[PDB]
């Protein structure tokens, strides 16, 4: 029905959403999902609005796994709203931290080529049908080639968090963003 005063204050501290926005999200989340529990099939349907269902399936599964921080197979409102807050309203530093953990498939603290390519392939499959791409990065192999060499500092075939944040900052989309710095 409505968020309790204790949960509302905990979510206030853990998100960048206002009290009005938090209450507005909770009713809509409960409307769109009566049980308060998002499974993979429902999550795939959300993503199916923006890109074709079959194409988006593999990447949608990987995102769902990162959303699910307690790894129990479902997403509650807290796990949804915190994950949505970081991705849409979080700082660039902490956005990349949330991203790093998604690429880290086994959960050791390192991104191998077997993991990095797998996520890149999943992005390319979803994107292919409506987005045209460049040319020197127009292959999942061409992409993972550019990434690892620009990031793997000590060349152990693995990517640490510190390598990830620094290496991603040279991305064209972030290059545009950094010119909008207030100071
Ligand atoms: Ca969960
Ligand atoms: Ca790993
Ligand atoms: Ca390394």
Author numbering: 6 to 188
Study authors write:
HPCA or hippocalcin, is a member of the neuronal calcium sensor (NCS) protein family and is highly expressed in hippocampal pyramidal CA1 neurons, in particular in their dendrites. It contains four EF-hands out of which only three are capable of binding calcium. In response to increased intracellular calcium, hippocalcin undergoes a conformational change and translocates from the cytosol to cellular membranes through a Ca2+/myristoyl switch mechanism. The extrusion of the myristoyl-containing hydrophobic N-terminus region from the hydrophobic pocket allows hippocalcin to localize to membranes where it can interact with downstream targets.
Mutations at positions T71N and A190T were shown to be critical in development of DYT2 dystonia. The crystal structure of hippocalcin(T71N) and hippocalcin(A190T) did not show any significant conformation difference when compared to the wild-type protein and they have identical crystal packing. Mutation site in hippocalcin T71N is located on the interface between N-lobe and C-lobe close to the area of interaction with peptides in NCS-1 (26), change from Thr to Asn strengthens inter-lobe interface by creating additional hydrogen bond between ND2 Asn71 and OG Ser106. Affinities for calcium for hippocalcin(T71N) (Kd = 93 ± 12 nM) was not significantly different from the wild-type, even though the mutation was located within the second EF-hand of hippocalcin. However, the cooperativity of calcium binding, shown by the Hill coefficient, significantly decreased from n = 1.4 ± 0.1 for the wild-type, to n = 0.7 ± 0.1 for hippocalcin(T71N). However, the decrease in cooperativity observed for hippocalcin(T71N) suggests that at low μM [Ca2+], hippocalcin(T71N) will only be partially Ca2+-bound which then could affect regulation of downstream calcium signalling cascades in stimulated cells. Oligomerisation upon calcium binding was also observed for the disease-causing mutants hippocalcin(T71N) and hippocalcin(A190T). However, the mutations significantly decreased the oligomer formation when compared to the wild-type protein. Disease-causing mutants of hippocalcin showed a marked oligomerisation defect suggesting that EF-2 and the C-terminus domain are important for dimerization. For the dystonia-causing mutants hippocalcin(T71N) and hippocalcin(A190T), calcium influx upon stimulation significantly increased to 51% and 62%, respectively, compared to hippocalcin wild-type.
